[PDB]
UniProtKB/Swiss-Prot annotation:
Subunit structure as annotated in this protein's UniProt entry: Component of the CSN complex, composed of COPS1/GPS1, COPS2, COPS3, COPS4, COPS5, COPS6, COPS7 (COPS7A or COPS7B), COPS8 and COPS9. In the complex, it probably interacts directly with COPS1, COPS2, COPS3, COPS5, COPS6, COPS7 (COPS7A or COPS7B) and COPS8. Interacts with TOR1A; the interaction is direct and associates TOR1A and SNAPIN with the CSN complex. Interacts with STON2; controls STON2 neddylation levels. Interacts with ERCC6.
Record function comment: Component of the COP9 signalosome complex (CSN), a complex involved in various cellular and developmental processes. The CSN complex is an essential regulator of the ubiquitin (Ubl) conjugation pathway by mediating the deneddylation of the cullin subunits of SCF-type E3 ligase complexes, leading to decrease the Ubl ligase activity of SCF-type complexes such as SCF, CSA or DDB2. Also involved in the deneddylation of non-cullin subunits such as STON2.
Positions of transmembrane segments: none
Whole-protein residues included: 296 to 366 of 406
Provenance organism: Mus musculus (Mouse)
Top-rank taxon, per record: Eukaryota
Compartment(s) where it occurs, according to its Swiss-Prot or TrEMBL record: Cytoplasm; Nucleus; Cytoplasmic vesicle, Secretory vesicle, Synaptic vesicle
Protein name as it appears in the record: COP9 signalosome complex subunit 4
Family: Belongs to the CSN4 family.
Amino acid sequence: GSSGSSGGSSILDRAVIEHNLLSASKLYNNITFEELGALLEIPAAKAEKIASQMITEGRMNGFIDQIDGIVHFETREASGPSSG
């Protein structure tokens, strides 16, 4: 299984990615690791881990879809199904 797996390569501004992740979460309703990484200029592997790390860090709200490999971001003014 030839997977990306990007350890150390670029030490770009990690803060930017963190914010960008939050910015995109408020911008792009949904984006893939490939695109997300292209936005942060980072690899999907990094954006994937970062995205996941962000959620775990509480920085980002939502979950990562491994079924479609898309990052599910939260949208302003949202809750879900009708509770009751």
